[PDB]
Design a protein around this nucleic acid. Sequence first.
DNA 1: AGGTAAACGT
DNA 2: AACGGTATTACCT
Length: 202
Amino acid sequence: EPLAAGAVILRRFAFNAAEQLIRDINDVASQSPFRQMVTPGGYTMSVAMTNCGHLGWTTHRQGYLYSPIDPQTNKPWPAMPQSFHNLCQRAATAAGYPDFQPDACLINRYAPGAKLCLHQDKDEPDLRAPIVSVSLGLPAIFQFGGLKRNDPLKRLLLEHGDVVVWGGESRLFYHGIQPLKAGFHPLTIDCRYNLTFRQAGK
DNA sequence: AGGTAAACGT
DNA sequence: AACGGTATTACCT
Ligand SMILES: [Fe+3]
């Protein structure tokens, strides 16, 4: 019944911290606005994204990249809010990763219908560090697979405040998000947000 | 030699 | 609509 080797779900872990997290998402986005990024192959992603911390994930003509600069504003990504950093540290510790030091937080916003096709997180050079993923707002179905794309999927509803952590043996597992169902949430109104914490540099 | 990118039909 | 083809290649370093 645990998610996977090295992976855990902490249901409602961030529920108490959620209102402050959402205030800080709005602050981050007031500086580096949400944008829907374009893949190298030229398709616009359905998820809108921004980043905070020292490195932000971005698409480019040439591929994917972690960059210290927001290519839309040409300014550094906003500093990682202390509320984000503290929640991440607490969740990582609860999940068995007490030494995790993230330097990058990708903020995803899902409107109805928005999805993330099954992929691997592998843009980070240090594979030893876990990924911490915080869900806020509307619920979504998270796919969590194996090392091969065709490995059987677990499908888990992620609700407001749920935190998922993966690392170690499951660090490179395929995962994704199924198209978001429309709904109402009193804190986010009509969307889902996700915070994904990584150590993207040295 | 390796790593990268991937988001339509059944 | 869950599953899997496609990158079975074309480019970089
Ligand atoms: Fe991911």
